Paper text:
Importin‐α is critical for successful nuclear import as it recognizes and binds to cargo proteins bearing a classical nuclear localization signal ([name]), which facilitates their transport from the cytoplasm into the nucleus. Importin‐α possesses an α‐solenoid tertiary structure characterized by a deep concave surface ideal for [name]‐cargo binding (Fournier et al. 2013). Notably, the twist causes the concave surface to become deeper at the N‐ and C‐termini, resulting in what is commonly known as the major (ARMs 2–4) and minor (ARMs 6–8) [name]‐binding grooves, respectively. In this study, we describe a combined computational and biophysical approach to design [name] [name] analogs, with zero net charge, and test their ability to target importin‐α.
To validate the computational modeling design, the analogs were co‐crystallized with importin‐α, and their structures were experimentally determined by X‐ray crystallography. The crystal structures of A1–A4 in complex with mImpα2 at resolutions ranging from 2.11 to 2.42 Å were determined. The electron densities of the 10 ARM domains of mImpα2 without the importin‐β‐binding (IBB)‐domain were clearly resolved including the P1–P6 and P′1–P′5 sites for the major and minor [name]‐binding grooves, respectively. The crystal structures had the same space groups as the original [name] [name]/importin‐α complex and every amino acid was resolved for all analogs bound at the major groove. Accordingly, the analogs bury an average surface area of 629.6 ± 21.2 Å2 in the major groove. Superpositioning the four analog structures at the major groove showed that the sequences also share almost identical binding modes, based on the alpha‐carbon's (Cα's) as the crystal structure of [name] [name]. The Cα backbone of the analogs exhibited RMSD values of 0.485, 0.529, 0.487, and 0.513 Å for A1, A2, A3, and A4, respectively, at the major groove. The analogs formed a total of 8–10 hydrogen bonds, 1 salt bridge, 37–40 VdW interactions, and 1–2 cation–π bonds. Visual inspection revealed that although the side chains for K299, K300, and K301 residues aligned at the P2, P3, and P4 sites, indicating that the analogs also relied on the consensus sequences for their binding, there were notable spatial orientational differences for some other residues and the amino acid contributions for A1–A4 changed significantly from the computational modeling. Crystal structures of these analogs complexed with mImpα2 confirmed their binding modes, albeit the novel interactions formed in the modeling procedure were disrupted by DTT used during crystallization.
Author numbering:
A (entry chain A): 72 to 496
B (entry chain C): 1 to 9
The structure:
């Protein structure tokens, strides 16, 4: 009966004075809006239906029309910002928050979903959802002794919505909303469902993408060990956000970085730095770059875990973007490391792959490599071994490349190159 | 994703 109605028919039913006729037309709208092929969102909006749907959310006596309207609005809210805005502008936010307490689980879940789409639009709607009081009722739905008793789909939707309330920057979510959410998030991060884990990690990744104070709020909750565990998961949808979270954390303080190391993270990098997914290798290498920017004792842990050969590996062969992160990781290591640590790097074979990357058409990577060479030469100067290095660089074709770079456009490039030639060749 | 439509139930 409610398959493939026209918008005109939906409108006629919705404007009837008959709740059952309105219910059938609302369901017909839900079915239109639930089709994967070009759902007619704008036509439904243009027909003026959103205010009617919103009013139906409040019909406690007709739970089916609450559900159908919720679903229809969910799918409108899933579209463009302008489509999401039409839902918000119809007063949907307070009406969905009221439904979070519905005795019908399918309706509460629909309201969770709709609020997730609203919040997911951006910081302003996220923050408006929060100001209307969404967080308390959302968290109340997860206030159970054991998360395993909840239906799987419902728990996944709640996790996803909460992740959207943690998402976006400029600004980041309200500090007090983050403090309120984090204890539930910590619990969900220990749940055994792969999709809940994935979304829980995304939420943590968002919360750690910011200044040191935001990182600290998360790290203080003791999640870093669980994140390192998830970093070793078999499911890529888990590894991706877990690694992003760990990566964000090591952009903080040397002390926040040490928690990642102490939790055992470095033992996972042999696999991450060889991972067949390009993006994992790239983000793992970026993570390493921010660990090598740390203290000498942290550099030493990188050395001890056998990770320098793996950096030589990525430098030698990887997607260009990963190779650029590896270049950074080396320049950092060389800027902060002791002489012995820098010697080790040369003994692992860093020179030839570094030199091969000097032929790249990226100015920034050339600057990075030139900086690293300078630091390595400096360490050799303290050992009286400048010539050994000069020879090495010459034999692998490096001197040729540095000469050319004296004739490079960029000022820093030609200067740093000239200095090296003048000082060591 | 950030937003998602409900397709079935």
């Amino acid at each position: 009966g409610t398959v493939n109605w026209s918008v005109e028919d939906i409108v006629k039913g919705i404007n009837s004075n008959n709740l059952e006729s309105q219910l059938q037309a609302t369901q017909a709208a839900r079915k239109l809006l639930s089709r994967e092929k070009q759902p007619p969102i704008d036509n439904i909006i243009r027909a003026g239906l959103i205010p009617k749907f919103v009013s139906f959310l409040g019909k406690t006596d007709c739970s089916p029309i609450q559900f159908e309207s919720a679903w229809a609005l969910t799918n409108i809210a899933s579209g463009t910002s302008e489509q999401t805005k039409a839902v918000v502008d119809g007063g949907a936010i307070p009406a969905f928050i009221s439904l979070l307490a519905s005795p019908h689980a399918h309706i509460s879940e629909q309201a969770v979903w709709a609020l997730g789409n609203i919040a997911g639009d951006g910081s302003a709607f996220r923050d408006l959802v929060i100001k209307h009081g969404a967080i308390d009722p959302l968290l109340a739905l997860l206030a159970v002794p054991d998360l395993s008793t909840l239906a799987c789909g419902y728990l996944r939707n709640l996790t996803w919505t909460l992740s959207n309330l943690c998402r976006n920057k400029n600004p980041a979510p309200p500090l007090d909303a983050v403090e309120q959410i984090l204890p539930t998030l910590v619990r969900l991060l220990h749940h055994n469902d792969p999709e809940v884990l994935a979304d829980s990690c995304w939420a943590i990744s968002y919360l750690t993408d910011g200044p040191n104070e935001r990182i600290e709020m998360v790290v203080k909750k003791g999640v870093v060990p669980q994140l390192v565990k998830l970093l070793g998961a078999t499911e890529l949808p888990i590894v991706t956000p877990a690694l992003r979270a760990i990566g964000n954390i090591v952009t903080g303080t040397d002390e926040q970085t040490q928690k990642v190391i102490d939790a055992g993270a470095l033992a996972v990098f042999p696999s991450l730095l060889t991972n067949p997914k390009t993006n994992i290798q790239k983000e793992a290498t970026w993570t390493m770059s921010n660990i090598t920017a740390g203290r000498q004792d942290q550099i030493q842990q990188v050395v001890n875990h056998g990770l320098v050969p793996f950096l030589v590996g990525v430098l030698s062969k990887a997607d260009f973007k990963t190779q650029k992160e590896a270049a950074w990781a080396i320049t950092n290591y060389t800027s902060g490391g002791t002489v012995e640590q820098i010697v080790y790097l040369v003994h692992c074979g860093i020179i030839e792959p570094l030199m091969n990357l000097l032929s790249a058409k990226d100015t920034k990577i050339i600057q990075v490599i030139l900086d690293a060479i300078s630091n390595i030469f400096q360490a050799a100067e303290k050992l009286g071994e400048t010539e050994k290095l000069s020879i090495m660089i010459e034999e692998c074709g490096g001197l040729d490349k540095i000469e050319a770079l004296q004739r490079h456009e960029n000022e820093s490039v030609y200067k740093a190159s000239l200095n090296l030639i003048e000082k060591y060749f | 994703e950030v937003k998602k439509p409900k397709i079935d139930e």
